[PDB]
């Protein structure tokens, strides 16, 4: 309907498909009312709307959280201890397209690297006492 905040699209109520994930566990919350149609930035949602979108994204988030770890933790550990793609591979075993696949969770088949990273975030020297 308008957008005097950014002047990009037109915040207008119109439920649609909200793909929370697009890497593996893609879970679209088909039915997210609010204010959108062309843009995807200046969006607005009320209590009910937020409750729905949240209830969904949350339900899936948790259900999926049951897995080993998240695609954010791993990368976070590699960027936290400055574990270059070379060192992390020589110690953990990321490989080549690690960061990439790992980002989506395709290279994180619950290997050993994960068990090392989780304990590495707290022990930036473990990699040296384990390598």
From Swiss-Prot:
Taxonomic lineage? Bacteria, Pseudomonadati, Pseudomonadota, Gammaproteobacteria, Enterobacterales
- Any one biological process term the GO annotation gives: single-species biofilm formation
Q: What molecular functions are annotated in GO for this chain?
A: metal ion binding; protein homodimerization activity; sequence-specific DNA binding
Positions contributing to Zn(2+) binding:
3, 6, 37, 40
Whereabouts does the entry annotate DNA binding, in residue ranges? 85-104
Instruction: Describe what happens without this gene.
Output: Essential for growth, it cannot be disrupted. A double mqsR-mqsA deletion leads to increased rpoS mRNA levels, resulting in increased cyclic-di-GMP levels, increasing stress resistance, increased biofilm formation. The double mutant has increased metabolism and respiration in the presence of the bile acid deoxycholate and consequently grows less well. Decreases cell survival in the presence of 20% deoxycholate.
**Textual note on the cofactor:** Binds 1 Zn(2+) ion per subunit.
| Gene source species | Escherichia coli (strain K12)
For activity, the cofactor(s) needed are: Zn(2+)
Effect listed in the UniProt record for changing residue 101 to A? 10-fold reduction in DNA-binding
**Record's GO cellular component, any one?**
toxin-antitoxin complex
Q: What induces it?
A: Induced by amino acid starvation, glucose starvation and when translation is blocked. Induction is decreased in the absence of the Lon protease suggesting, by homology to other toxin-antitoxin systems, that Lon may degrade the MqsA antitoxin. Transcription is activated by MqsA. It has been suggested that MqsA represses its own operon. Not more induced in persister cells. A member of the mqsRA operon. This operon induced by ectopic expression of toxins RelE, HicA and YafQ but not by MazF or HicA.
Q: How does activity depend on temperature?
A: The MqsR-MqsA complex is exceptionally thermostable with a Tm of 83.4 degress Celsius versus 48.1 degress Celsius for MqsR and 61.1 degress Celsius for MqsA.
Swiss-Prot/TrEMBL keywords: DNA-binding, Metal-binding, Repressor, Stress response, Toxin-antitoxin system, Transcription, Transcription regulation, Zinc
Subunit info here reads: Homodimer. Crystallizes as a heterotetramer with MqsA, MqsR-MqsA(2)-MqsR. Purifies as a probable heterohexamer of 2 MqsR dimers and 1 MqsA dimer. Binds promoter DNA as a dimer. When the 2 dissociate the MsqR mRNA interferase becomes active.
Q: What is known of its domains?
A: The Zn-binding N-terminal domain (residues 1-65) binds to the MqsR mRNA interferase toxin and makes contact with the DNA phosphate backbone, while the C-terminus (residues 70-131) binds the promoter in a sequence-specific manner. They are linked by a short flexible domain.
Name the UniProt record assigns to this protein: Antitoxin MqsA
- Give start and end of each HTH cro/C1-type domain: 74-127
Q: Output the PTM entry.
A: Degraded in the presence of oxidative stress, maybe by the Lon and/or ClpX proteases.
Keyword hit for Kinase:
no
Return any one Pfam family short name: MqsA_antitoxin
